[PDB]
Design a protein around this ligand. Structure first.
Ligand SMILES: CCCCCCCC/C=C\CCCCCC(=O)OC[C@@H](O)CO
Ligand SMILES: CCCCCCCC/C=C\CCCCCC(=O)OC[C@@H](O)CO
Ligand SMILES: CCCCCCCC/C=C\CCCCCC(=O)OC[C@@H](O)CO
Ligand SMILES: CCCCCCCC/C=C\CCCCCC(=O)OC[C@H](O)CO
Ligand SMILES: CCCCCCCC/C=C\CCCCCC(=O)OC[C@H](O)CO
Ligand SMILES: CCCCCCCC/C=C\CCCCCC(=O)OC[C@H](O)CO
Ligand SMILES: CCCCCCCC/C=C\CCCCCC(=O)OC[C@H](O)CO
Ligand SMILES: CCCCCCCC/C=C\CCCCCC(=O)OC[C@H](O)CO
Ligand SMILES: CCCCCCCC/C=C\CCCCCC(=O)OC[C@H](O)CO
Lengths: 90, 97, 117
């Protein structure tokens, strides 16, 4: 899974950077949050597919809501990394 | 296709306004990240809760105890996320202002 | 109209917490651990950002625990028979819960170390 590669890289970079414990916790948690939301989104998708492969308005609605959740989580991670790194290198 | 709903617009706008306020506050970087992520988590959780509700409704209109339980548990998640946001903002802005 | 939704959702929420509490010792013990951590964090001599990280990390455990149990309830609602996708939904949801918990433990270990070590 190439999401776990993305994670280890983030952990390494956060480890590699010379920041204090708080910053490192925020950098890493924001990435872990994306992982948690992706997994929950995938669980919901699995349930939707369990019900039927045929299209339905509410199946689409479920999947789109789940995907927006993942998107908000990724945006939060980008913002977190941008803010902490700008401040670290200020 | 869901952004055109009174409930999501109201929740979305509150979160958006909080992110905007946080972007303008004179706080340090760690504080700013915490103010922003705590409200974004409210939105994430609310979206996952609506996702689950949609799957429940997909199954049908016949009531089942577990259908009610799924929706209740999703709402409780949102509630905890909201409390966490209030606690985060209160602790950080008491400290600062 | 925006006030009736709050009262309504609040009621669903309480029923969610109540059902989870009544139905499983493990949930009750988790809730005890969470409440303990929040109380402890609230009384520790640490800066405000550390205090928020200690509290929000255990709250996230509770948030993911509840979303996952919501997913379990839907799966069980559909049927009790074995189905690959049913198993997969629960596997993914449980993985998410475990990540939240491990992150909480590590967050607490790091911050309590840095503050004491
Ligand atoms: C600041 C902390 C906020 C909360 C943090 C998360 C805590 C979540 C855990 C538990 C909430 C209470 C659950 C209801 C209690 C309950 O059902 O009692 C049994 C009776 O119902 C029996 O009739
Ligand atoms: C329903 C479950 C509730 C769980 C939480 C119950 C609240 C009590 C929890 C823990 C108490 C143990 C530690 C006490 C030590 C103490 O007196 O320290 C005071 C000083 O540190 C103040 O500076
Ligand atoms: C919801 C009910 C609240 C009831 C609250 C009852 C009082 C609880 C107070 C403190 C909990 C113990 C942990 C903090 C103790 C402390 O300062 O430790 C500093 C270090 O030397 C050791 O970690
Ligand atoms: C949807 C639109 C998003 C567009 C994004 C891509 C474009 C950004 C390109 C270059 C950066 C220019 C230099 C700006 C540096 C910058 O942002 O600095 C922060 C402060 O310096 C912190 O204090
Ligand atoms: C001088 C300092 C001024 C400080 C101004 C503070 C304004 C924000 C207040 C509380 C915390 C954020 C709100 C947390 C709850 C939240 O975002 O709820 C969304 C919807 O209500 C439900 O989706
Ligand atoms: C949720 C809706 C709330 C609606 C009412 C909101 C009222 C305005 C409050 C705060 C704005 C920020 C004010 C402080 C700006 C601030 O800290 O500025 C310092 C430096 O000048 C920055 O460089
Ligand atoms: C979606 C792409 C996001 C791309 C990034 C947008 C982030 C915007 C947030 C806040 C503005 C604050 C800008 C300053 C950030 C920063 O690190 O400031 C040092 C301390 O915040 C105060 O000393
Ligand atoms: C539906 C929402 C329910 C949620 C209810 C929340 C009530 C307020 C909680 C905590 C703030 C008290 C903060 C006062 C003491 C204080 O200054 O704490 C900050 C410090 O800066 C930390 O170090
Ligand atoms: C249902 C919601 C229940 C909410 C439960 C959790 C509430 C945590 C609040 C405060 C902890 C901090 C206590 C005060 C810390 C403190 O002294 O901060 C100021 C100093 O002056 C800074 O130097």
């Amino acid at each position: 899974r190439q999401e776990g590669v993305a994670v280890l890289l983030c952990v390494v970079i956060a480890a590699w950077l010379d920041v204090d414990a708080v910053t490192r916790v925020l950098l890493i948690s924001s990435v872990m949050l994306v992982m948690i939301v992706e997994l929950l989104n995938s669980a919901i998708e699995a349930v939707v597919d369990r019900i039927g492969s045929e299209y339905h308005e509410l199946s689409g609605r479920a999947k789109d809501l789940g995907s927006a959740a993942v998107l908000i989580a990724i945006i939060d991670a980008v913002i977190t990394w941008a803010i902490l790194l700008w401040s670290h290198f200020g």
